[PDB]
Amino acid sequence: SFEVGMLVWHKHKKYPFWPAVVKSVRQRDKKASVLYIEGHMNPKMKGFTVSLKSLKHFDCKEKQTLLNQAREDFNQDIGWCVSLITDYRVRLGCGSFAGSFLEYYAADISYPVRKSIQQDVL
């Protein structure tokens, strides 16, 4: 039950679970397409292929554990995710915006957050 534009976790070998957004889902044969959320991304870069079985929903019970695991070697980076996802969920929840995470990242309303990130690389 992974829908397109949903937020998920994915683990590449040797790497910790990282958040991502779903772009394609091949519902009827166990595979999906996904793109990592990270401080600087291209939201128009096509989604690399995974399998449904390997995805956790972003808001699963494991969340807090998964987020700490990432803060081991990627504190600043996992920070950049949480900033974006959190900022996106505010616009959504406080009514200021209605599109998808990727649309958030491309729109002018992400600016104030992308600025902090992009510059933090400074």
Author numbering: 409 to 530
What does the literature reporting this entry say, word for word?
The PWWP domain comprises 100–130 amine acids and is often present in chromatin-associated proteins. Taken together, similar to other members in the ‘Royal family’, PWWP domain also exhibits methyllysine histone binding ability.
By fluorescence polarization assay, we found that the PWWP domains in BRPF1, BRPF2, HDGF2, MUM1 and the N-terminal PWWP domains of WHSC1 and WHSC1L1 show weak binding affinity to histones with H3K36, K3K79 or H4K20 methylation.
